[PDB]
């Protein structure tokens, strides 16, 4: 006759609980499937993309069970500016008798190592196959830098298409193309609205979507039926994600860099400041291993304008007091995961949308900010994400010098001015400083119809740099 909390705590103890990561693992022997890595830190990053007013927080909640805030009391229902994050752990039963489509399950971040089987009729125990994180990209036309930032942090894609609306949705196509720009061909298609459709209409939508993707780069993207209200066939989503999406090559020989996209300070209001915490920036790992008690630097830094007007970018160097990976404060960071890096920086730096799309680096490494850069770019034929009512979907216009073009370097939102244009290369001056380390693939957006529209991809070749000031 124990209460619910006692039963769940007993299952938590019997399930192994949440192990603590040892301080100094033998790094050169660990893989993302290792027990020390798979228990507390994310390994595969996946994103949800779809049209507006379709529901990406609801499907993510059904998959995982972790809600997204969608804050500011006005963005709660229309669209979101910041990232909607959630944590999912994917489990499979260790018994062969269980149904393979249904043995897959997903649970919250606070779940134990081995939860009991929730299927009535089997005494097996679940096993965490692989750890994933889910990110909610904002699907609206006014917010385009956020989607490209998500593509930069995303390594897997989840497209959402509703049924009762128009089958060839342009925003879904634009998201798919922007993800293909990010060199990501591991995409999964999902049908958002299924219940209100008939027998024939679901197949009609399936054939329409099949016709939608025949000439694009995507080849083997599966189509999955799911409903965001009944909370069913989420095991199908986890199955498809585990089977189709592999782990990108990411190991210890690569240099540590991080790409910070969000910002959340830790400052409890009303509580005495004597019990506080430093400023925390939210960023993902694309290369390198991090540890508690290191020193980081935000190289774009404080951007000051002098009397002349030149950009003085002071790197913000700081000491990492805490490393957080999706459940608890841990020590060692595996490449390919989202982490809130907390340091002793002033809380003003981590409150608002300020550290949006920037890079940070550890000591012994000097990335370079740039002012004038050279980029090799190419376009497509038709505009994506626009609705031309049956008249010749607009074709991209050629770039013009001295035009404000939003050159999103992977995730960095920079407003570049063209100083020269040739057949396939361009030169741009940046007002907001942008760093370049190795490749940092780029997307380009322009403005004609009062908004920002993606036009094509871009890759940096050279540029004039400004060495950091001490």
């Amino acid at each position: 006759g124990e209460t619910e909390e006692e039963k769940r705590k007993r299952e938590f103890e019997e399930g192994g609980g949440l192990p603590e990561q040892p301080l100094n693992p033998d790094f050169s022997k660990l893989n993302p499937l290792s027990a020390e890595i798979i228990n507390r830190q994310a390994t595969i990053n996946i994103g949800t993309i779809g049209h507006v007013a379709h529901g990406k927080s609801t499907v993510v909640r059904a998959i995982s069970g972790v809600q997204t805030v969608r804050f500011k009391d006005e963005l709660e229902r229309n669209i979101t500016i910041k990232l909607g994050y959630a944590n999912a752990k994917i489990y499979k039963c260790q018994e062969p008798t269980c149904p393979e489509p249904d043995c897959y399950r997903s649970f919250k971040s606070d779940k134990e190592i081995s939860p009991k089987c929730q299927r009535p009729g089997c005494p097996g125990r679940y096993k965490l196959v692989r750890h994933v994180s889910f990110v909610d990209c904002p699907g609206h036309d006014i917010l385009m830098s956020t989607m490209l930032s998500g593509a930069a942090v995303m390594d897997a894609a989840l497209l959402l298409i509703a049924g009762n609306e128009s089958c060839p949705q342009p925003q879904t196509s634009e998201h798919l193309a922007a993800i293909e720009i990010m060199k990501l061909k591991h995409v999964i298609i999902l049908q958002n609205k299924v219940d209100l459709m008939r027998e024939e209409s679901a197949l009609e939508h399936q054939k329409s979507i099949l016709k939608f993707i025949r000439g694009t780069i995507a080849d083997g993207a599966p189509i999955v039926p799911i409903s965001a209200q009944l909370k069913y066939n989420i095991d199908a989503v986890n199955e498809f994600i585990v089977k189709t999406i592999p782990v990108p090559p990411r190991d210890f020989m690569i240099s540590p860099r991080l790409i910070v996209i969000r910002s959340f300070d830790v400052n409890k209001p009303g509580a005495e400041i004597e019990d506080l915490k430093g400023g925390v920036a939210g960023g993902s790992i694309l290369n390198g291993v991090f540890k508690l008690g290191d020193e980081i630097e935000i190289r774009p830094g404080i951007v000051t304008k002098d009397d002349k007007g030149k950009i003085q970018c002071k790197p913000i160097f700081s000491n990492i007091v805490s490393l957080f990976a999706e459940q608890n404060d841990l020590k060692f960071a595996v490449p390919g995961g989202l982490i809130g890096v907390g340091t002793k920086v002033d809380p003003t730096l981590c409150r608002a949308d300020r550290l949006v799309g920037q890079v940070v680096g550890a000591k012994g490494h000097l990335p370079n900010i740039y002012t004038d850069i050279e980029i090799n770019y190419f376009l497509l034929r038709r505009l994506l994400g626009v609705k031309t009512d049956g008249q010749k979907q607009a074709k991209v216009r050629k770039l013009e010098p001295n035009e404000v073009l939003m050159v999103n370097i992977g995730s960095t939102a920079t407003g570049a001015r063209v100083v020269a244009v040739k057949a396939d290369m361009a030169r741009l001056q940046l007002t907001s400083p942008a760093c370049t380390e190795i490749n940092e693939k780029i997307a380009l957006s322009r403005r004609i119809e009062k908004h920002w529209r993606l036009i094509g991809w871009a890759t940096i070749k050279k540029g004039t740099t400004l060495e950091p000031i001490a």
């Binding site: 219940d195 399936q206 999955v224 039926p225």
Partner: peptide, 23 residues
């Protein structure tokens, strides 16, 4: 291919028809 999508389609419609026959 999209054939193994229709199997989950049929499973899900069976689930719905079991759930709410009113609609």
């Amino acid at each position: 291919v999209g054939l193994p999508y229709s199997e989950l389609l049929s499973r899900f419609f069976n689930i719905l028809r079991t759930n709410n026959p009113e609609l």
